[PDB]
Design a protein around this ligand. Structure first.
Ligand SMILES: CC(=O)SCCNC(=O)CCNC(=O)[C@H](O)C(C)(C)COP(=O)(O)OP(=O)(O)OC[C@H]1O[C@@H](n2cnc3c(N)ncnc32)[C@H](O)[C@@H]1OP(=O)(O)O
Length: 461
């Protein structure tokens, strides 16, 4: 029935959905701002229409009514939002489904439940998936100390500020509880005059584990194993590997089963990611991303399952096993390991500020075990400051994690992007580290390894 699909996004994810639609025999429609007129994704579609005229380009890509008008005028039957712009916007999906179009994503109840921290926590508690294990809703200093007694140490507080502000207090010594709560409440009453006091069990050096979930409208929910997104610079993802080679396979299966149980309890449809924090055989639920992730490519590599094609086919209403052809959960293969590096314009010698300018040289590696998902990184492209810093996603996969590391080193040295500074020396330093190659990297690994910032002098004749 569905014949034409509009992508309400830009960059590499728009090209990825375009490739999936062309492989599924669907016509493609692109949208682009005036400042994004030289984007690759504009010319990779059958139709391209300017949206958000007279607006800021990132506001143009958030224009719900303009995108819906373009989809209606072009005859598009479906809208794929990609990620990061309107993929989790409840109003956009509501208006798209009210216009008669197909929103390639989860249902509206999933979108508002996982777009709200309280609702997501309530769903996780209903599905018996443990979060960060404290009596957080208790508001008392005596409540805080008894909370410290019943589960344990350390304890990190939210007495400083309500929304988006954390106390972040290190509590180890038994007297440090008492005087730290004293100073924390003394600072808390003077802070803003009004707020909310929350308690939280602090997790020291956790592992960020995400489980990829696919679900159709018929009720079949499968997981596509997990990814390790622990390599993070200031709570921002740098390198994601799949599967979590550091963790034992039975523990990874347990985490994936917990994610499957949660998504089956909420009745999840289409693609989604369940995030976790992992520490010494304990895992804690954090969030559900109700959209396709940037690092879905390594899951595709290690499972052999086209996630975007499955997204479109589930949006068509097809069964996960009968019509799409995905096997049962026990028959989902683990084809090996895979590493994703996001090459951006962030200059690591300049405090990871996104560089701008014209790319004069672009050479892309290839060969065995290499996957490329390029954005706008061609030679002669002018890097605008409006959009994301990402140039190209490079994915290396092999039967063994060590060969994936070796191939990633080969392609990071082979990659030649000139005219703008890239994070390639930082990525080389990270994959050269013995913690990452062993797979024992945690979320605090980047900030606690200053040797990653010693970049050698490049001659550049
Ligand atoms: C297929 C693979 O496995 S490649 C994996 C690693 N890639 C390479 O070794 C590519 C060849 N080597 C190089 O280009 C460089 O010497 C590097 C990558 C080792 C060092 O990087 P840089 O310091 O920034 O470049 P360098 O100053 O040394 O070389 C200058 C130019 O001579 C070129 N060059 C490099 N090797 C040769 C060569 N054997 N013959 C002719 N030109 C060469 C480089 O391409 C470079 O051009 P560029 O500006 O487009 O990058």
């Amino acid at each position: 029935h569905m014949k034409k699909l509009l992508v309400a996004n830009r960059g590499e994810i728009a090209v990825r959905v375009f490739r999936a639609c062309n492989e599924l025999g669907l016509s493609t429609v692109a949208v682009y701002a005036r400042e994004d007129e030289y984007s690759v994704h504009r010319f990779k579609a059958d139709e391209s229409y300017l949206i958000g005229q007279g607006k800021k380009p990132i506001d143009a890509y958030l224009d719900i009514d303009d995108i819906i008008r373009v989809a209606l005028e072009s005859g598009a039957d479906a809208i794929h939002p990609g990620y990061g712009l309107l993929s989790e916007n409840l109003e956009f999906a509501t208006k798209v489904r009210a216009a008669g179009l197909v929103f390639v994503g989860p249902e509206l109840h999933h979108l508002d439940i996982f777009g709200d921290k309280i609702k997501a926590k309530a769903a996780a508690d209903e599905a018996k998936v443990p979060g960060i294990p404290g009596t957080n809703g208790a508001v008392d200093i005596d409540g805080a100390l008894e909370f410290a007694k019943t589960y344990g140490y350390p304890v990190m507080i939210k007495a400083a500020l309500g929304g988006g502000g954390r106390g972040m207090r290190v509590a180890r010594n038994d007297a440090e509880m008492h005087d730290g709560y004293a100073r924390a409440k003394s600072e808390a009453i003077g802070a803003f005059g009004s707020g909310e006091i929350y308690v939280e069990k602090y997790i020291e050096n956790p592992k960020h584990i995400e489980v990829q979930i696919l679900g159709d409208r018929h009720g079949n929910i499968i997981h596509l194993h997990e990814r390790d997104c622990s390599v993070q610079r200031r709570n921002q993802k740098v390198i994601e590997i799949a599967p979590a080679v550091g963790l034992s396979p039975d523990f990874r299966n347990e985490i994936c089963e917990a994610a499957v149980k949660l998504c089956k309890n909420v009745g999840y449809v289409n693609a989604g990611t369940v995030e976790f924090l992992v520490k010494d055989d304990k895992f804690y639920f954090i969030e559900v991303n109700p959209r396709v992730q940037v690092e879905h490519t390594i899951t595709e590599l290690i499972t052999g399952v086209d996630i975007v094609q499955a997204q479109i086919l589930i949006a068509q209403g097809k069964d996960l096993h009968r019509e799409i052809g995905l096997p049962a959960q026990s028959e989902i293969p683990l084809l090996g390991s895979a590493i994703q590096c996001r090459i951006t314009t962030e200059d690591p010698q300049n405090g990871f500020l996104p560089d701008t300018g014209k790319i004069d040289t672009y050479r892309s590696p290839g060969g065995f075990g290499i996957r490329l998902d390029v954005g706008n990184a061609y030679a002669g492209y002018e890097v605008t400051p409006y959009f994301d810093s990402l140039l190209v996603k490079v994915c290396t996969f092999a039967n063994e994690f060590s060969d994936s590391v070796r191939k990633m080193d080969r392609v990071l040295h082979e990659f030649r992007i000139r005219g703008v500074k890239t994070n390639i020396p930082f990525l080389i330093n990270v994959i050269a580290n013995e913690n990452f190659t062993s797979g024992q990297a945690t979320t605090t690994f980047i900030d606690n390894t200053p040797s990653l910032f010693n970049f050698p002098r490049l001659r550049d004749r």
